[PDB]
Coordinates of C-alpha atoms and ligand atoms in Angstrom, one line a residue:
Chain A
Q1 CA -0.1 -0.3 0.1
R2 CA 1.2 3.5 -1.1
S3 CA 0.5 6.5 0.5
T4 CA -2.9 8.1 -1.0
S5 CA -3.0 11.5 -2.9
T6 CA -5.4 13.3 -5.0
Chain B
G1 CA 2.5 25.5 -30.0
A2 CA 0.7 22.9 -32.1
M3 CA -2.5 24.0 -30.7
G4 CA -2.0 27.7 -31.4
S5 CA -4.4 27.3 -34.4
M6 CA -7.1 25.7 -32.4
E7 CA -9.9 27.7 -31.0
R8 CA -9.8 27.5 -26.9
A9 CA -13.5 26.4 -26.8
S10 CA -12.4 23.5 -29.3
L11 CA -9.5 22.5 -27.0
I12 CA -11.5 22.4 -24.2
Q13 CA -14.0 20.2 -25.8
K14 CA -11.4 17.9 -26.9
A15 CA -10.0 17.6 -23.7
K16 CA -13.1 16.1 -22.5
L17 CA -13.2 14.0 -25.3
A18 CA -9.9 12.6 -24.3
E19 CA -10.9 12.3 -20.6
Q20 CA -13.7 9.7 -21.9
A21 CA -11.3 8.0 -24.1
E22 CA -8.6 7.8 -21.3
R23 CA -6.2 9.4 -23.8
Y24 CA -4.3 11.3 -20.8
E25 CA -1.5 12.5 -22.8
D26 CA -4.0 14.1 -25.4
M27 CA -5.9 15.4 -22.9
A28 CA -3.1 17.2 -21.2
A29 CA -1.8 18.7 -24.6
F30 CA -5.3 19.9 -25.2
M31 CA -5.3 21.9 -21.6
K32 CA -1.8 23.3 -22.4
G33 CA -2.9 24.6 -25.6
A34 CA -6.1 26.2 -23.6
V35 CA -3.9 27.6 -21.0
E36 CA -1.7 29.0 -23.5
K37 CA -4.6 31.1 -24.8
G38 CA -3.9 33.4 -22.0
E39 CA -7.1 33.5 -20.3
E40 CA -7.8 32.4 -17.0
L41 CA -9.3 28.7 -16.5
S42 CA -12.8 28.2 -15.0
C43 CA -13.2 25.7 -12.2
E44 CA -14.2 22.9 -14.7
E45 CA -11.2 23.7 -16.8
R46 CA -9.0 23.5 -13.8
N47 CA -10.1 20.0 -13.2
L48 CA -9.4 18.8 -16.9
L49 CA -5.9 20.4 -16.6
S50 CA -5.0 18.8 -13.4
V51 CA -6.7 15.4 -14.1
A52 CA -4.8 15.3 -17.2
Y53 CA -1.4 16.0 -15.9
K54 CA -2.1 13.7 -13.0
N55 CA -2.6 10.8 -15.0
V56 CA 0.2 11.4 -17.4
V57 CA 2.8 11.9 -14.7
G58 CA 1.2 9.1 -12.4
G59 CA 2.0 6.5 -15.2
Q60 CA 5.4 7.8 -15.5
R61 CA 5.8 7.6 -11.8
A62 CA 4.7 4.1 -11.8
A63 CA 7.1 2.9 -14.3
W64 CA 9.9 4.8 -12.9
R65 CA 9.3 2.6 -9.6
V66 CA 9.3 -0.5 -11.3
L67 CA 12.8 0.4 -12.6
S68 CA 14.4 1.7 -10.0
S69 CA 13.3 -1.3 -8.1
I70 CA 15.1 -3.4 -10.6
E71 CA 18.0 -1.0 -10.6
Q72 CA 18.4 -1.2 -6.8
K73 CA 18.1 -5.1 -7.1
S74 CA 20.9 -5.1 -9.6
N75 CA 23.1 -3.4 -7.0
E76 CA 22.6 -6.0 -4.1
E77 CA 25.6 -8.6 -3.1
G78 CA 25.5 -11.6 -5.4
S79 CA 23.8 -9.9 -8.3
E80 CA 25.1 -10.5 -11.6
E81 CA 26.3 -7.5 -13.4
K82 CA 24.3 -7.0 -16.7
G83 CA 25.6 -3.7 -18.2
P84 CA 24.2 -0.2 -18.4
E85 CA 20.7 -0.7 -19.9
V86 CA 18.7 -0.8 -16.5
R87 CA 20.3 2.6 -15.5
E88 CA 19.8 4.0 -18.9
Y89 CA 16.2 2.9 -19.5
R90 CA 15.4 4.4 -15.9
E91 CA 17.2 7.5 -16.7
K92 CA 15.0 7.7 -19.9
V93 CA 11.7 7.4 -18.2
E94 CA 13.2 9.9 -15.5
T95 CA 13.9 12.5 -18.1
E96 CA 10.6 12.3 -19.6
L97 CA 8.7 12.9 -16.1
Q98 CA 11.1 15.3 -15.3
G99 CA 10.0 17.1 -18.7
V100 CA 6.4 16.7 -18.1
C101 CA 7.1 18.4 -14.6
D102 CA 8.8 21.1 -16.0
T103 CA 6.1 22.0 -18.3
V104 CA 3.3 21.8 -15.8
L105 CA 5.4 24.0 -13.6
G106 CA 6.0 26.7 -16.5
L107 CA 2.5 26.7 -17.2
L108 CA 1.9 27.5 -13.5
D109 CA 4.6 30.2 -13.6
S110 CA 3.6 31.6 -17.2
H111 CA 1.2 32.8 -15.8
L112 CA -1.4 30.7 -14.2
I113 CA -0.5 31.5 -10.4
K114 CA 0.0 35.2 -10.9
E115 CA -3.3 35.9 -12.8
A116 CA -5.2 33.7 -9.8
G117 CA -6.9 36.2 -7.5
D118 CA -9.7 33.9 -6.0
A119 CA -8.9 31.5 -3.2
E120 CA -10.2 28.6 -5.2
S121 CA -7.9 29.0 -8.2
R122 CA -4.6 30.5 -6.1
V123 CA -4.8 27.5 -3.9
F124 CA -5.5 25.2 -6.6
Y125 CA -2.8 26.2 -8.6
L126 CA -0.2 26.3 -5.5
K127 CA -1.2 22.9 -4.5
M128 CA -0.2 21.7 -8.3
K129 CA 3.1 23.4 -7.9
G130 CA 3.8 21.8 -4.7
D131 CA 2.8 18.3 -6.3
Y132 CA 4.9 18.7 -9.2
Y133 CA 8.0 19.8 -7.2
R134 CA 7.3 16.7 -5.1
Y135 CA 7.3 14.4 -8.0
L136 CA 10.6 16.1 -9.2
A137 CA 11.6 15.6 -5.5
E138 CA 10.7 11.7 -5.9
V139 CA 13.5 11.2 -8.5
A140 CA 16.1 13.7 -7.2
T141 CA 19.7 12.4 -5.8
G142 CA 21.8 15.1 -6.3
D143 CA 23.0 18.6 -5.3
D144 CA 19.5 20.5 -5.9
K145 CA 17.4 17.9 -4.2
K146 CA 17.3 20.2 -1.2
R147 CA 16.1 22.8 -3.2
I148 CA 13.5 21.0 -4.9
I149 CA 12.2 19.6 -1.6
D150 CA 12.0 23.3 -0.4
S151 CA 10.6 24.5 -3.3
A152 CA 7.6 21.8 -3.0
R153 CA 7.3 22.8 0.7
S154 CA 7.2 26.7 0.1
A155 CA 4.3 26.2 -2.6
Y156 CA 2.2 23.8 0.0
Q157 CA 2.6 26.3 2.6
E158 CA 1.8 29.1 0.8
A159 CA -1.6 27.3 -0.4
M160 CA -2.4 26.3 3.1
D161 CA -2.3 29.5 4.5
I162 CA -4.5 31.0 2.0
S163 CA -6.9 27.9 2.4
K164 CA -7.1 28.4 6.1
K165 CA -8.1 31.9 5.9
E166 CA -10.7 32.0 2.9
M167 CA -11.8 28.4 2.6
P168 CA -14.0 26.4 5.1
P169 CA -12.6 23.1 6.6
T170 CA -14.7 21.0 4.2
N171 CA -13.8 22.6 1.1
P172 CA -12.6 19.9 -1.4
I173 CA -9.6 21.9 -2.7
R174 CA -8.6 22.6 1.2
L175 CA -8.9 18.8 2.0
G176 CA -6.9 17.8 -1.0
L177 CA -4.1 20.0 -0.4
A178 CA -3.9 19.0 3.3
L179 CA -3.7 15.7 2.1
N180 CA -1.1 15.9 -0.3
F181 CA 0.9 18.0 1.8
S182 CA 0.8 15.6 4.7
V183 CA 2.1 12.8 2.0
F184 CA 4.8 15.3 1.0
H185 CA 5.9 15.3 5.2
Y186 CA 5.8 11.5 5.0
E187 CA 7.1 10.3 1.9
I188 CA 9.7 13.4 1.2
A189 CA 10.5 15.3 4.0
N190 CA 11.2 12.6 6.6
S191 CA 8.6 14.1 8.8
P192 CA 6.2 11.1 9.7
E193 CA 5.0 13.0 12.9
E194 CA 4.1 16.1 10.9
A195 CA 2.4 14.0 8.3
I196 CA 0.3 12.3 11.1
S197 CA -0.8 15.5 12.8
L198 CA -1.8 17.3 9.6
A199 CA -3.8 14.6 8.6
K200 CA -5.5 14.3 12.0
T201 CA -6.3 18.0 12.5
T202 CA -7.6 18.2 9.0
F203 CA -9.9 15.1 9.3
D204 CA -11.2 16.6 12.7
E205 CA -11.8 19.8 11.5
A206 CA -13.7 18.9 8.7
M207 CA -15.8 16.7 10.5
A208 CA -17.0 19.4 12.8
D209 CA -18.0 21.1 9.7
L210 CA -20.0 18.6 7.9
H211 CA -23.3 19.9 9.6
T212 CA -23.1 23.1 7.5
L213 CA -23.3 21.1 4.0
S214 CA -25.9 19.9 1.8
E215 CA -26.2 16.2 0.8
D216 CA -24.1 16.7 -2.1
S217 CA -21.4 18.7 -0.5
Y218 CA -21.2 16.2 2.1
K219 CA -20.5 13.5 -0.1
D220 CA -17.7 15.3 -1.8
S221 CA -16.0 16.3 1.5
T222 CA -16.4 12.7 3.3
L223 CA -14.8 11.2 0.2
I224 CA -11.5 13.0 0.6
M225 CA -11.9 12.7 4.3
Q226 CA -11.8 9.1 3.8
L227 CA -8.4 9.4 1.9
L228 CA -6.8 11.2 5.0
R229 CA -8.4 8.3 7.2
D230 CA -6.5 5.7 5.0
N231 CA -3.2 7.3 5.1
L232 CA -3.7 7.5 9.0
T233 CA -4.6 3.8 8.9
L234 CA -1.3 2.9 6.8
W235 CA 0.9 5.3 9.2
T236 CA -0.2 4.5 12.4
Chain C
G1 CA 16.1 4.9 -37.0
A2 CA 16.5 6.4 -33.5
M3 CA 17.4 2.7 -32.3
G4 CA 20.1 2.2 -34.8
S5 CA 22.9 3.1 -32.5
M6 CA 21.7 0.7 -29.7
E7 CA 23.0 -2.9 -29.3
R8 CA 20.5 -5.6 -30.5
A9 CA 20.9 -7.4 -27.1
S10 CA 20.2 -4.2 -25.3
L11 CA 17.1 -3.5 -27.2
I12 CA 15.8 -6.8 -26.4
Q13 CA 16.7 -6.2 -22.7
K14 CA 15.1 -2.9 -22.6
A15 CA 12.0 -4.4 -24.2
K16 CA 11.7 -6.9 -21.8
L17 CA 12.1 -3.8 -18.9
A18 CA 9.4 -1.9 -20.8
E19 CA 7.1 -5.0 -20.3
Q20 CA 7.5 -5.1 -16.7
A21 CA 6.9 -1.4 -16.5
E22 CA 3.9 -1.7 -18.8
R23 CA 5.8 1.0 -21.1
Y24 CA 4.3 -0.6 -24.2
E25 CA 5.1 2.4 -26.5
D26 CA 8.6 1.9 -25.7
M27 CA 8.5 -1.7 -25.8
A28 CA 7.4 -1.5 -29.5
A29 CA 10.0 1.0 -30.4
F30 CA 12.7 -1.1 -28.9
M31 CA 11.6 -4.1 -30.7
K32 CA 11.1 -2.1 -33.8
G33 CA 14.8 -1.4 -33.7
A34 CA 15.7 -4.8 -33.0
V35 CA 13.8 -6.2 -36.1
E36 CA 15.8 -3.4 -38.0
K37 CA 18.8 -4.9 -37.1
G38 CA 18.3 -7.5 -40.0
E39 CA 18.5 -10.6 -38.0
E40 CA 15.8 -13.0 -37.6
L41 CA 13.9 -13.0 -34.5
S42 CA 13.7 -15.8 -31.8
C43 CA 10.7 -17.3 -30.6
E44 CA 10.9 -15.1 -27.4
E45 CA 11.5 -11.9 -29.4
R46 CA 8.7 -12.8 -31.7
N47 CA 6.2 -12.7 -28.5
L48 CA 7.9 -9.5 -27.4
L49 CA 7.5 -7.8 -30.8
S50 CA 3.7 -9.0 -31.0
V51 CA 2.7 -8.1 -27.4
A52 CA 4.1 -4.7 -27.6
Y53 CA 2.1 -3.6 -30.6
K54 CA -0.9 -5.5 -29.5
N55 CA -1.1 -3.3 -26.7
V56 CA -0.1 -0.2 -28.4
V57 CA -2.9 -0.8 -31.2
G58 CA -5.2 -2.0 -28.6
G59 CA -5.3 1.0 -26.7
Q60 CA -6.1 3.1 -29.7
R61 CA -8.6 0.9 -30.8
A62 CA -10.4 1.1 -27.5
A63 CA -10.1 5.2 -27.7
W64 CA -11.4 4.9 -31.4
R65 CA -14.5 2.8 -30.4
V66 CA -15.4 5.7 -27.8
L67 CA -14.7 8.4 -30.2
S68 CA -16.9 6.8 -33.1
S69 CA -19.4 5.7 -30.7
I70 CA -20.0 9.7 -29.5
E71 CA -19.6 10.6 -33.2
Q72 CA -22.3 8.3 -34.2
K73 CA -24.8 9.7 -31.6
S74 CA -24.1 13.2 -32.9
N75 CA -25.4 12.3 -36.0
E76 CA -29.0 11.0 -34.7
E77 CA -32.1 12.6 -35.0
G78 CA -32.5 15.2 -32.3
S79 CA -28.7 15.6 -31.5
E80 CA -27.5 19.2 -31.1
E81 CA -24.9 20.3 -33.8
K82 CA -21.8 20.5 -31.9
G83 CA -19.3 21.3 -34.9
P84 CA -16.2 19.6 -36.4
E85 CA -14.5 18.7 -33.0
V86 CA -15.7 15.2 -32.5
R87 CA -15.0 14.0 -36.2
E88 CA -11.6 15.9 -35.8
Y89 CA -10.5 14.2 -32.8
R90 CA -11.8 10.8 -34.1
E91 CA -9.8 11.2 -37.3
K92 CA -6.5 12.4 -35.1
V93 CA -6.8 8.9 -33.2
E94 CA -7.6 7.2 -36.3
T95 CA -4.5 8.4 -38.3
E96 CA -2.4 7.7 -35.4
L97 CA -3.8 4.1 -35.3
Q98 CA -3.3 3.5 -39.4
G99 CA 0.0 4.8 -38.8
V100 CA 1.0 2.0 -36.0
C101 CA -0.6 -0.4 -38.5
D102 CA 1.3 0.6 -41.3
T103 CA 4.5 0.5 -39.4
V104 CA 4.0 -3.1 -38.3
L105 CA 3.2 -4.2 -41.7
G106 CA 6.1 -2.5 -42.9
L107 CA 8.3 -4.6 -40.5
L108 CA 6.7 -7.9 -41.8
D109 CA 7.4 -6.9 -45.4
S110 CA 10.7 -5.6 -44.9
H111 CA 11.8 -8.4 -44.4
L112 CA 10.3 -10.7 -41.3
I113 CA 8.1 -12.7 -43.4
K114 CA 10.2 -13.4 -46.3
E115 CA 13.3 -14.8 -44.0
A116 CA 10.9 -16.7 -42.3
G117 CA 11.0 -20.3 -43.2
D118 CA 9.9 -22.3 -40.0
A119 CA 6.4 -23.1 -39.7
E120 CA 6.4 -21.3 -36.1
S121 CA 7.9 -18.2 -37.5
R122 CA 6.1 -18.1 -40.7
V123 CA 2.8 -18.6 -39.5
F124 CA 3.3 -16.1 -36.7
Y125 CA 3.8 -13.4 -38.9
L126 CA 1.1 -13.9 -41.2
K127 CA -1.1 -14.2 -38.3
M128 CA 0.1 -10.8 -37.5
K129 CA -0.1 -9.4 -40.9
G130 CA -3.9 -10.6 -40.8
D131 CA -4.6 -8.9 -37.2
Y132 CA -3.1 -5.2 -38.6
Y133 CA -4.9 -5.5 -41.8
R134 CA -8.0 -6.5 -39.8
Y135 CA -7.5 -3.4 -37.4
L136 CA -7.2 -1.2 -40.8
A137 CA -10.5 -2.8 -41.8
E138 CA -12.0 -1.9 -38.4
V139 CA -11.7 2.0 -39.3
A140 CA -11.9 1.6 -43.1
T141 CA -15.2 3.1 -44.8
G142 CA -14.1 4.2 -48.4
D143 CA -13.0 2.7 -51.6
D144 CA -10.0 0.4 -50.6
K145 CA -12.0 -1.1 -47.7
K146 CA -12.9 -4.1 -49.8
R147 CA -8.9 -4.5 -50.6
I148 CA -8.0 -4.0 -47.1
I149 CA -10.3 -6.8 -45.8
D150 CA -9.1 -9.1 -48.9
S151 CA -5.5 -8.5 -47.5
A152 CA -6.4 -9.6 -44.2
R153 CA -8.4 -12.8 -45.3
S154 CA -5.3 -13.7 -47.7
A155 CA -2.7 -13.4 -44.8
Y156 CA -4.7 -15.5 -42.5
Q157 CA -5.6 -18.0 -45.0
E158 CA -2.1 -18.5 -46.0
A159 CA -1.3 -18.8 -42.4
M160 CA -4.0 -21.4 -42.0
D161 CA -2.9 -23.5 -44.7
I162 CA 0.8 -23.5 -43.3
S163 CA -0.5 -24.4 -39.6
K164 CA -2.5 -27.2 -40.7
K165 CA -0.1 -28.9 -42.6
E166 CA 3.0 -28.2 -40.3
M167 CA 1.5 -27.9 -36.6
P168 CA -0.3 -29.8 -34.2
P169 CA -3.9 -28.9 -33.6
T170 CA -3.0 -28.1 -30.2
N171 CA -0.2 -25.7 -31.1
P172 CA -0.8 -22.3 -29.3
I173 CA -0.1 -20.3 -32.6
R174 CA -2.4 -22.6 -34.5
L175 CA -5.0 -22.2 -32.1
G176 CA -4.4 -18.0 -31.6
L177 CA -4.6 -17.8 -35.3
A178 CA -7.8 -19.8 -36.0
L179 CA -9.1 -17.7 -33.0
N180 CA -8.5 -14.5 -34.6
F181 CA -9.4 -15.6 -38.1
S182 CA -12.8 -16.6 -36.7
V183 CA -13.0 -13.2 -35.2
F184 CA -12.4 -11.6 -38.6
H185 CA -15.2 -13.7 -40.3
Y186 CA -17.8 -12.5 -37.4
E187 CA -16.7 -8.9 -37.1
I188 CA -15.3 -8.0 -40.4
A189 CA -16.4 -10.2 -43.2
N190 CA -20.1 -10.6 -42.2
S191 CA -19.8 -14.4 -42.3
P192 CA -20.7 -15.4 -38.7
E193 CA -21.4 -19.1 -39.7
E194 CA -18.1 -19.2 -41.0
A195 CA -16.8 -17.9 -37.7
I196 CA -19.0 -20.5 -35.6
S197 CA -17.7 -23.3 -37.8
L198 CA -14.1 -22.5 -37.6
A199 CA -14.1 -21.9 -34.0
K200 CA -16.0 -25.2 -33.3
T201 CA -13.9 -27.3 -35.6
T202 CA -10.4 -25.9 -33.9
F203 CA -11.7 -26.4 -30.5
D204 CA -12.7 -30.1 -31.2
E205 CA -9.8 -30.8 -33.2
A206 CA -7.6 -29.5 -30.3
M207 CA -9.6 -31.5 -27.6
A208 CA -8.9 -34.9 -29.5
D209 CA -4.9 -34.0 -29.4
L210 CA -4.7 -33.2 -25.7
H211 CA -3.8 -36.6 -25.0
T212 CA -0.7 -36.5 -26.5
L213 CA 0.6 -33.3 -24.3
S214 CA 2.7 -32.7 -21.4
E215 CA 1.0 -31.0 -18.2
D216 CA 2.5 -27.7 -19.2
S217 CA 1.7 -27.9 -23.2
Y218 CA -1.8 -28.9 -22.0
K219 CA -2.1 -25.5 -19.7
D220 CA -0.9 -23.6 -22.8
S221 CA -3.5 -25.3 -25.4
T222 CA -6.5 -25.3 -22.9
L223 CA -6.1 -21.7 -22.1
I224 CA -6.5 -20.4 -26.0
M225 CA -9.2 -23.1 -26.2
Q226 CA -11.1 -21.4 -23.5
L227 CA -10.9 -18.3 -25.5
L228 CA -12.7 -20.2 -28.6
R229 CA -15.5 -21.4 -26.0
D230 CA -16.0 -17.7 -24.9
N231 CA -16.5 -16.5 -28.5
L232 CA -18.7 -19.7 -29.3
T233 CA -20.9 -18.7 -26.3
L234 CA -21.1 -15.4 -27.1
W235 CA -22.1 -15.9 -31.0
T236 CA -24.3 -18.5 -30.4
Chain D
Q1 CA -18.9 -8.3 -24.3
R2 CA -16.6 -8.1 -27.2
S3 CA -15.3 -10.9 -29.3
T4 CA -12.0 -12.1 -27.7
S5 CA -8.9 -12.2 -29.9
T6 CA -5.1 -13.1 -28.9
Ligands
LIG301 C1 -11.6 15.0 -15.4 C2 -12.5 15.8 -14.7 C3 -13.7 15.1 -14.2 C4 -13.5 13.5 -14.3 C5 -15.0 15.7 -15.2 O1 -14.1 15.6 -12.8 C6 -13.1 15.1 -11.8 C7 -13.8 15.4 -10.6 O2 -13.6 16.8 -10.2 C8 -14.4 17.2 -8.9 O3 -13.6 16.8 -8.1 C9 -12.1 17.3 -7.9 C10 -11.2 16.0 -7.8 C11 -11.2 15.0 -7.3 C12 -12.2 14.3 -6.3 C13 -11.7 14.2 -5.1 C14 -13.0 13.2 -7.0 O4 -14.2 13.0 -6.5 C15 -10.1 14.1 -7.9 C16 -9.8 14.8 -9.2 O5 -8.2 14.7 -9.5 C17 -9.8 16.4 -8.6 C18 -10.0 17.2 -10.2 C19 -8.6 17.0 -8.1 C20 -8.7 17.6 -6.7 C21 -7.5 18.3 -6.3 C22 -6.7 19.2 -7.2 O6 -5.5 19.6 -7.1 C23 -5.1 20.7 -7.9 C24 -7.7 19.0 -5.2 C25 -8.9 18.0 -4.5 C26 -9.9 17.7 -5.9 C27 -11.1 18.6 -5.9 C28 -10.5 19.7 -7.0 C29 -12.2 17.7 -6.5 O7 -13.1 18.9 -6.2 C30 -15.6 16.9 -9.1 O8 -16.3 17.4 -8.0 C31 -15.6 15.3 -9.0 O9 -17.1 15.1 -9.0 C32 -14.9 14.7 -10.4 O10 -14.9 13.4 -10.4
LIG302 C1 5.4 -10.3 -23.6 C2 5.7 -11.5 -23.4 C3 5.5 -12.5 -22.2 C4 4.6 -11.6 -21.4 C5 6.8 -12.6 -21.7 O1 5.1 -13.8 -22.7 C6 3.8 -13.6 -23.3 C7 3.3 -14.8 -23.5 O2 4.1 -15.6 -24.2 C8 3.6 -17.0 -24.7 O3 2.4 -17.2 -24.9 C9 1.8 -16.6 -26.4 C10 0.9 -15.4 -26.2 C11 0.0 -15.6 -25.5 C12 -0.7 -16.7 -24.5 C13 -2.1 -17.0 -24.9 C14 -0.7 -16.4 -23.2 O4 -1.0 -17.6 -22.1 C15 -0.9 -14.1 -25.6 C16 0.3 -13.4 -26.3 O5 -0.4 -12.2 -26.8 C17 1.0 -14.2 -27.0 C18 2.4 -13.8 -26.9 C19 0.5 -14.2 -28.5 C20 0.1 -15.3 -29.3 C21 -0.3 -15.1 -30.3 C22 0.5 -14.2 -31.6 O6 0.2 -14.1 -32.9 C23 1.0 -13.2 -33.7 C24 -0.8 -16.3 -31.2 C25 -1.2 -17.1 -30.0 C26 -0.4 -16.7 -28.6 C27 0.9 -17.8 -28.8 C28 2.5 -17.2 -29.3 C29 1.4 -18.0 -27.1 O7 2.4 -18.8 -27.1 C30 4.1 -17.6 -23.4 O8 3.6 -19.2 -23.8 C31 3.1 -17.3 -22.3 O9 3.4 -17.9 -21.1 C32 3.4 -15.8 -22.2 O10 2.4 -15.1 -21.1
LIG303 CL1 17.1 3.7 -23.1
LIG304 CL1 -2.6 33.8 3.6
LIG305 CL1 -7.9 16.9 -33.1
LIG306 CL1 0.7 -24.7 -46.7
LIG307 MG1 -10.5 32.4 -30.7
LIG308 MG1 26.5 -14.9 -10.5
LIG309 MG1 18.7 12.1 -14.1
LIG310 MG1 -7.6 37.1 -12.3
LIG311 MG1 26.0 -5.3 -32.6
LIG312 MG1 -32.0 21.0 -29.2
LIG313 MG1 -9.7 8.6 -41.8
LIG314 MG1 15.0 -17.9 -42.4

């Protein structure tokens, strides 16, 4: 799992 | 550029078609053309710009990470020498990624940011500036690395200060900025505590303001809120 | 071309890295470079060539179909006139698709097919020739459409005749050729009965020959067999 | 569902 961005 | 002869409205229309077709490089090129007309972008138009480049660079980043992992494994004890090819190909992808980032940063600097007076627009573009410097930082390994990191930090910070003064806690742009700045802290700046504290305080402040919202706004804000929660779960 | 200065082995290596990274345009360009060295391709190398271009053109085809659907809806009773943009963009994608097909056909003609003497290689390349003419046929609407269809048919037929003489019923290339020729019949040539009969007879002949195979070969052959069954289910 | 090729 990677860090999530938007 | 190659889009100089196409009407602004036609570029917008074609960006939207490209989006439907998942043709993100074309989408990005159409929106670059639209920006280069010199007029400010509407809210919807900003979203097209951001989605186009996010997808282009996102693909490049994902490829870069595959190649960098293979390269790093090639440098481990007991790995057979295989020549310059993995490095060369990683470098090719890297250079193309950097080029896209430089293109986006150039649109922001000439002249999207300077013309953006409303907090929605200004924060949006400063968030983008932080994002693309962040992507440059992900691949940076030499003497400008600190300066690239600081450029990302600076842009994010300016956007944060505006967003806190001018936008409600639940505004989607403010929330997405906080999300991404927290990612910066965790993944780039070696500041996991700062990342966690920002994500928590952003989430909590937004939760306290949901009561002010319509059902639609509620749906939009709680969406990004869930992304914050996902990172907090991963990081804690 | 731009790959003229790169070693053949390095192009192969980089094609494989590109595959891992899902960088199919790069993969295709590396394999074009390798072909252009003038040496025959090995079995593994042929697969890299075919997968690279299949993925590139497949993306283009999928985009073209989205755009063509929007265009067709624009031409329905009661649809608002929106100007030339949808047609223009469909045409842009189409022209790029055609270009890729022409590139592949050019590699086959200069000089992969003429140098291919073993049935594995010859059938493989003739199948590709049929595929890329098929893709040209999918977008063709004018005075060469019949000739493009016939070119696809011709290539497929030659490959079929060789495959039946020289390969067992379960050979994966023979099976994939039959699969694709059946698709040609159904989707291009207005010959659904021919499509169905080919798919059935191919499937049945392969089933009768499975007993001759190792576990690994069995797995490879029954894979494509399932694709035949999937089409038969859809078409009947 | 489209026709499947390989
Ligand atoms: C390409 C544009 C389309 C697909 C039409 O719209 C994308 C989306 O655009 C809007 O959503 C934005 C938006 C996203 C939402 C979180 C999706 O729901 C994700 C997108 O990438 C987008 C455009 C980006 C951002 C981000 C931009 O930073 C520079 C900050 C947070 C977020 C804001 C701007 C969202 O409001 C809408 O509210 C969504 O509905 C729609 O899916
Ligand atoms: C890109 C190459 C990689 C991913 C390494 O290999 C692709 C695949 O290559 C081989 O499989 C081929 C193969 C496929 C198999 C059906 C996958 O299982 C699908 C592929 O597209 C590929 C290469 C193509 C064809 C097709 C070519 O026409 C010109 C005819 C049928 C089929 C043959 C050549 C298969 O043998 C192997 O037997 C598979 O194992 C591997 O996944
Ligand atoms: Cl390279
Ligand atoms: Cl401020
Ligand atoms: Cl166009
Ligand atoms: Cl023959
Ligand atoms: Mg004008
Ligand atoms: Mg060794
Ligand atoms: Mg570099
Ligand atoms: Mg202004
Ligand atoms: Mg050499
Ligand atoms: Mg009307
Ligand atoms: Mg045309
Ligand atoms: Mg030969």
